[PDB]
């Protein structure tokens, strides 16, 4: 809760900082889920 992430890796659709997807800059999700790391 203290690390404010600002990644753009999602599927969901006033606009956020993740409008860089519309310029061709996407974010891939990691292979290991945080539940698996925990």
């Amino acid at each position: 809760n203290k690390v404010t992430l600002a990644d753009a890796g999602f599927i969901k659709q006033r606009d956020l900082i993740c409008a860089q997807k519309f310029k061709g800059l996407t974010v891939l999700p990691p292979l290991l889920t945080d539940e698996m790391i925990a």
Partner: protein, 325 residues
């Protein structure tokens, strides 16, 4: 098939076991919707190019064109061009276009230039940020005798540099020498106002200067508009602004003077309709990246396609009718 594109991107015939990014994914638009204003009243270009006669170079005049649809195929009824090419002048929109006209010598068609003159530095200065189109019209047949029209004078020297779009109607003679004078002549105190000496080629030109960073359009073009369709990827054209995206409703709070709408960065996110006067929300249609999952060409030929970053309800359902692109 995606196996052959995996072969083409790797530049080999055997594909090892893994996941490979081959190409991208883009949904193509369908419509070609253009939206122009309502006006039908044509532009009085015959009053600009034709009159009883023209005006002087320092006693110039700029004719304003407003609430009109222009036409440039009728411009050649009776031509180097700067900025906007004239082949795309039949479908562009502006707010106001200025039409300033002056008269010059036949050996003076070269000096007047935005970034390059002799008579211009002191009679008519043109700014560096120019967009507009000049008319090259000879008038040796129109005006050649001992005294054609005595409404035209010019001066060849002034006290300093002239700013762009400046006019001096001061009835006063100038000097370029050392001693001060007032009305009387002497050591370089003669008259600067020289009349045109017509003898057998005066050039009578018309400059049609355009604008930049247009307002809500008052002038328009003869191209007819089309109806507005929402909720799909539409190649739109709003007052000359080209683009492609889904024209979804805005749900915004536009001020009554604003027509453009942008994102955090430079992105045309919102526009206002020229006829409906309803604000919209420009969103690009569905796109993403493609990664092909192959278990290896030495084992099988089946492939798995992963469209990265999209939902499963955005894939094209017409998988059999994808040949028409």
């Amino acid at each position: 098939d995606p196996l052959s594109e995996t072969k083409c991107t790797l530049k080999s015939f055997t594909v090892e076991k893994g996941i490979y990014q081959t190409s991208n994914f883009r949904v193509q638009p369908t419509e070609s919707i253009v939206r122009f204003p309502n006006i039908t009243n044509l532009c009085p270009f015959d009053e600009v190019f034709n009159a009883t006669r023209f005006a002087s170079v320092y006693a110039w005049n700029r004719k304003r064109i407003s609430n009109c649809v222009a036409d440039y195929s009728v411009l050649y009824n009776l031509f180097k061009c700067y900025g906007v090419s004239p082949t795309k002048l039949n479908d562009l929109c502006f707010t106001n276009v200025y039409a300033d006209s002056f008269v010059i010598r036949g050996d003076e068609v070269r000096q007047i230039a935005p970034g390059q003159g002799n008579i211009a530095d002191y009679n008519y200065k043109l700014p560096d940020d120019f967009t507009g189109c000049v008319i090259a019209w000879n008038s040796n047949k129109l005006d050649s005798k001992v005294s054609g029209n005595y409404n035209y004078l010019y001066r060849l020297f002034r006290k300093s540099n002239l700013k762009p779009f400046e006019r001096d109607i001061s009835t006063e003679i100038y000097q370029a020498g050392n001693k001060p004078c007032n009305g009387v002549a002497g050591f370089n105190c003669y008259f600067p106002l020289r009349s045109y000496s017509f003898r057998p080629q005066p050039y009578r030109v018309v400059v049609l200067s355009f604008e930049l960073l247009h307002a809500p359009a008052t002038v328009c073009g003869p191209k007819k508009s089309t109806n507005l369709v929402k909720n799909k990827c539409v190649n739109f054209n709003f007052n000359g602004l080209k683009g492609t995206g889904v024209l979804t409703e805005s749900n915004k709070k536009f001020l009554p003077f604003q027509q453009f709408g942008r994102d955090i960065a430079d992105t045309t996110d919102a526009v206002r309709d020229p006829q409906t006067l309803e604000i919209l929300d420009i969103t690009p249609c569905s796109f993403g990246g493609v990664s092909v999952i192959t278990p290896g060409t030495n084992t099988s030929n089946q492939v798995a396609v992963l469209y990265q970053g999209v939902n499963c309800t955005e894939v094209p359902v017409a998988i059999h009718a994808d040949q028409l692109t």
